[PDB]
Write an enzyme that holds these catalytic residues in place. Structure first.
Site, PDB file in Angstrom:
ATOM      1  N   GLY A  17       2.394   4.951  -1.990  1.00 44.50           N
ATOM      2  CA  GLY A  17       1.178   4.154  -2.109  1.00 44.50           C
ATOM      3  C   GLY A  17       1.285   3.018  -1.118  1.00 44.50           C
ATOM      4  O   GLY A  17       2.245   2.960  -0.333  1.00 44.50           O
TER       5      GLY A  17
ATOM      6  N   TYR B  37       2.302   0.005  -1.457  1.00 47.36           N
ATOM      7  CA  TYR B  37       3.377  -0.977  -1.801  1.00 47.36           C
ATOM      8  C   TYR B  37       4.804  -0.387  -1.785  1.00 47.36           C
ATOM      9  O   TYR B  37       5.795  -1.131  -1.793  1.00 47.36           O
ATOM     10  CB  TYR B  37       3.209  -1.467  -3.262  1.00 47.36           C
ATOM     11  CG  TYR B  37       2.061  -2.412  -3.615  1.00 47.36           C
ATOM     12  CD1 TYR B  37       2.072  -3.748  -3.214  1.00 47.36           C
ATOM     13  CD2 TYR B  37       1.036  -1.997  -4.465  1.00 47.36           C
ATOM     14  CE1 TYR B  37       1.051  -4.611  -3.592  1.00 47.36           C
ATOM     15  CE2 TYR B  37       0.023  -2.853  -4.838  1.00 47.36           C
ATOM     16  CZ  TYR B  37       0.032  -4.155  -4.400  1.00 47.36           C
ATOM     17  OH  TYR B  37      -0.979  -5.008  -4.762  1.00 47.36           O
TER      18      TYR B  37
ATOM     19  N   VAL C 273       5.706   5.914  -5.446  1.00 48.39           N
ATOM     20  CA  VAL C 273       5.063   6.166  -6.717  1.00 48.39           C
ATOM     21  C   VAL C 273       5.617   7.484  -7.277  1.00 48.39           C
ATOM     22  O   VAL C 273       5.833   8.444  -6.523  1.00 48.39           O
ATOM     23  CB  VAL C 273       3.537   6.291  -6.570  1.00 48.39           C
ATOM     24  CG1 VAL C 273       2.857   6.367  -7.938  1.00 48.39           C
ATOM     25  CG2 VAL C 273       2.974   5.136  -5.750  1.00 48.39           C
TER      26      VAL C 273
ATOM     27  N   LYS D 225       4.490   2.907 -10.183  1.00 47.74           N
ATOM     28  CA  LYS D 225       4.702   2.514  -8.825  1.00 47.74           C
ATOM     29  C   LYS D 225       5.721   1.395  -8.725  1.00 47.74           C
ATOM     30  O   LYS D 225       5.690   0.410  -9.485  1.00 47.74           O
ATOM     31  CB  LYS D 225       3.380   2.202  -8.133  1.00 47.74           C
ATOM     32  CG  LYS D 225       2.654   0.971  -8.585  1.00 47.74           C
ATOM     33  CD  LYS D 225       1.286   0.943  -7.904  1.00 47.74           C
ATOM     34  CE  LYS D 225       0.730  -0.474  -7.766  1.00 47.74           C
ATOM     35  NZ  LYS D 225      -0.743  -0.508  -7.518  1.00 47.74           N
TER      36      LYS D 225
ATOM     37  N   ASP E 134     -11.631  -3.982  -0.913  1.00 46.41           N
ATOM     38  CA  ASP E 134     -11.079  -2.843  -0.147  1.00 46.41           C
ATOM     39  C   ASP E 134     -11.506  -1.494  -0.732  1.00 46.41           C
ATOM     40  O   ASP E 134     -10.719  -0.570  -0.880  1.00 46.41           O
ATOM     41  CB  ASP E 134      -9.565  -3.000  -0.091  1.00 46.41           C
ATOM     42  CG  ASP E 134      -8.902  -2.149   0.971  1.00 46.41           C
ATOM     43  OD1 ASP E 134      -9.499  -1.774   1.998  1.00 46.41           O
ATOM     44  OD2 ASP E 134      -7.774  -1.833   0.724  1.00 46.41           O
TER      45      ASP E 134
HETATM   46  C1  LIG Z   1      -4.830   3.561  -6.723  1.00 45.28           C
HETATM   47  C2  LIG Z   1      -4.193   3.931  -5.472  1.00 45.28           C
HETATM   48  C3  LIG Z   1      -2.839   4.526  -5.718  1.00 45.28           C
HETATM   49  O1  LIG Z   1      -2.029   4.011  -6.478  1.00 45.28           O
HETATM   50  N1  LIG Z   1      -2.658   5.707  -5.105  1.00 45.28           N
HETATM   51  C4  LIG Z   1      -1.475   6.467  -5.005  1.00 45.28           C
HETATM   52  C5  LIG Z   1      -0.995   6.852  -3.755  1.00 45.28           C
HETATM   53  C6  LIG Z   1       0.098   7.694  -3.663  1.00 45.28           C
HETATM   54  C7  LIG Z   1       0.721   8.156  -4.801  1.00 45.28           C
HETATM   55  C8  LIG Z   1       0.278   7.761  -6.053  1.00 45.28           C
HETATM   56  C9  LIG Z   1      -0.816   6.907  -6.168  1.00 45.28           C
HETATM   57  N2  LIG Z   1      -1.248   6.456  -7.437  1.00 45.28           N
HETATM   58  C10 LIG Z   1      -1.561   7.208  -8.534  1.00 45.28           C
HETATM   59  N3  LIG Z   1      -1.546   8.541  -8.425  1.00 45.28           N
HETATM   60  C11 LIG Z   1      -1.859   9.256  -9.516  1.00 45.28           C
HETATM   61  N4  LIG Z   1      -1.848  10.613  -9.415  1.00 45.28           N
HETATM   62  C12 LIG Z   1      -1.547  11.500  -8.361  1.00 45.28           C
HETATM   63  C13 LIG Z   1      -1.322  11.068  -7.063  1.00 45.28           C
HETATM   64  C14 LIG Z   1      -0.961  11.971  -6.077  1.00 45.28           C
HETATM   65  C15 LIG Z   1      -0.824  13.331  -6.364  1.00 45.28           C
HETATM   66  N5  LIG Z   1      -0.415  14.251  -5.360  1.00 45.28           N
HETATM   67  C16 LIG Z   1      -0.259  15.669  -5.705  1.00 45.28           C
HETATM   68  C17 LIG Z   1      -0.146  16.542  -4.446  1.00 45.28           C
HETATM   69  N6  LIG Z   1       0.929  16.075  -3.568  1.00 45.28           N
HETATM   70  C18 LIG Z   1       2.261  16.277  -4.189  1.00 45.28           C
HETATM   71  C19 LIG Z   1       0.713  14.672  -3.227  1.00 45.28           C
HETATM   72  C20 LIG Z   1       0.663  13.812  -4.472  1.00 45.28           C
HETATM   73  C21 LIG Z   1      -1.072  13.754  -7.669  1.00 45.28           C
HETATM   74  C22 LIG Z   1      -1.426  12.851  -8.655  1.00 45.28           C
HETATM   75  N7  LIG Z   1      -2.202   8.764 -10.718  1.00 45.28           N
HETATM   76  C23 LIG Z   1      -2.215   7.426 -10.813  1.00 45.28           C
HETATM   77  C24 LIG Z   1      -1.891   6.603  -9.750  1.00 45.28           C
HETATM   78 CL1  LIG Z   1      -1.842   4.896  -9.970  1.00 45.28          CL
END
Ligand SMILES: *CCC(=O)Nc1ccccc1Nc1nc(Nc2ccc(N3CCN(C)CC3)cc2)ncc1Cl
Ligand SMILES: [Cl-]
Length: 347
Positions: A25, A27, A30, A45, A140
């Site tokens: 993410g 920061y 995650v 995170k 943002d």
């Molecule tokens: C709000 C912005 C933020 O926190 N975004 C972010 C960025 C990267 C990773 C996690 C994340 N935050 C959250 N993600 C999820 N769920 C989620 C994220 C990414 C995936 N992908 C599945 C396919 N690949 C393996 C890439 C990762 C799946 C689910 N839920 C909550 C937050 Cl806070």
């Protein structure tokens, strides 16, 4: 041993276990984790902000805002893990609802139906209504800051750049620096504005609506001033009236130095789009921030008529306020405020 994920400590046990890397993410790392108390997977995170004042500022903003907000269309903070003592505290772990994806990823892979677009836009504006009712600006908004689940449920996240609105102090020079993501900046940002008004978020939402309609960013500037040229490439040169509203001498001179541009009709840019969506888009992407549509008006727009319902659109109890203005505080002081703010989650 504390739990490890791809060579990094992830010290969230014993409560949170069974970790999986999900991405980087803004920061840090995650993960998804199993919460042994609530018997459910969550997102966690890892924040390590304490070396830098700006990371400290953003971390504290986000925590304070998100602990105070409670709304279906806004990501929560469920739990925060940090060390028992402040000297020990080098990382903060912020626990949030686990979502499926974000709009940015969805738009790489899927052309959205008009129904999905309409519902997504409703949810964004529903959440923004609540944010704005607290006199808070997200500042943002973009597809990657909109989390989604399988059910098309939407949550706004990443409040690191949020401020309390301050229209009295919005005015600033031409060429002022700005932090928020380039493609989603309102034109005034490059002209006279510090982005301390609600109209700043409405622009960003309009950019997101355009992006949902075509799967392309509408204004993909490559550099600061370029961004504004892209904007004018669709809106056309500003009107006389709109020129006259800019007080910066530099700014309106800069605008008059540019070559005239023909307004590109929305009809023509998005030939298959719902005419009601385009009418709302027009009103969100209006050059003059004073004339730009407000969140309640956008919600009440005909495009969103199947959803708009004030009885199901909560608002905040009262305006938000920073207790201390965070930008004149050094990082050690910000670390203390962060410690304090996170103490309610300590055993
Ligand atoms: C709000 C912005 C933020 O926190 N975004 C972010 C960025 C990267 C990773 C996690 C994340 N935050 C959250 N993600 C999820 N769920 C989620 C994220 C990414 C995936 N992908 C599945 C396919 N690949 C393996 C890439 C990762 C799946 C689910 N839920 C909550 C937050 Cl806070
Ligand atoms: Cl530039």
């Amino acid at each position: 041993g504390p739990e490890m994920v791809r060579g990094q400590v992830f010290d969230v046990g014993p409560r949170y276990t069974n970790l999986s890397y999900i991405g980087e993410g803004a920061y840090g790392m995650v993960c998804s984790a199993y919460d042994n108390v609530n018997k459910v997977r969550v997102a966690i995170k890892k924040i390590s902000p304490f070396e830098h004042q700006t990371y400290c500022q953003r971390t504290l903003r986000e925590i304070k805002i998100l602990l105070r907000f409670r709304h279906e269309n806004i990501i929560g903070i469920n739990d925060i893990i940090r060390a028992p003592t402040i000297e020990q505290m080098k990382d903060v772990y912020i626990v949030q609802d686990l979502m499926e994806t974000d709009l940015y990823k969805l738009l790489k892979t899927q052309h959205l139906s008009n129904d999905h677009i309409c519902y997504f836009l409703y949810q964004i504006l529903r959440g923004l209504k609540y944010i704005h009712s607290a006199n808070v600006l997200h500042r943002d908004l973009k597809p990657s800051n909109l989390l989604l689940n399988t059910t098309c449920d939407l949550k706004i996240c990443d409040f690191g750049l949020a401020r309390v609105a301050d229209p009295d102090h919005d005015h600033t020079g031409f060429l002022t620096e700005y932090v928020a993501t380039r493609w989603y900046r309102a034109p005034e940002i490059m002209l006279n504005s510090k982005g301390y008004t609600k109209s700043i978020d409405i622009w960003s939402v309009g950019c997101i609506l355009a992006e949902m309609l075509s799967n392309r960013p509408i204004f993909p500037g490559k550099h600061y001033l370029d961004q504004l040229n892209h904007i004018l490439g669709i809106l056309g040169s500003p009107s006389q009236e709109d020129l006259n509203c800019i007080i910066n001498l530099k700014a309106r001179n800069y605008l008059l130095s540019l070559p005239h541009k023909n307004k590109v009709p929305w009809n023509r840019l998005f030939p298959n789009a719902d005419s009601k969506a385009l009418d709302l888009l027009d009103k969100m992407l209006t050059f003059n921030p004073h004339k730009r549509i407000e969140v309640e008006q956008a919600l009440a727009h005909p495009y969103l008529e199947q959803y708009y319902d004030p009885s199901d659109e909560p608002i905040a109890e009262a305006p938000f306020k920073f207790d201390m203005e965070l930008d004149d505080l050094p990082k050690e002081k910000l670390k203390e405020l962060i410690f304090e703010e996170t103490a309610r989650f300590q055993p």
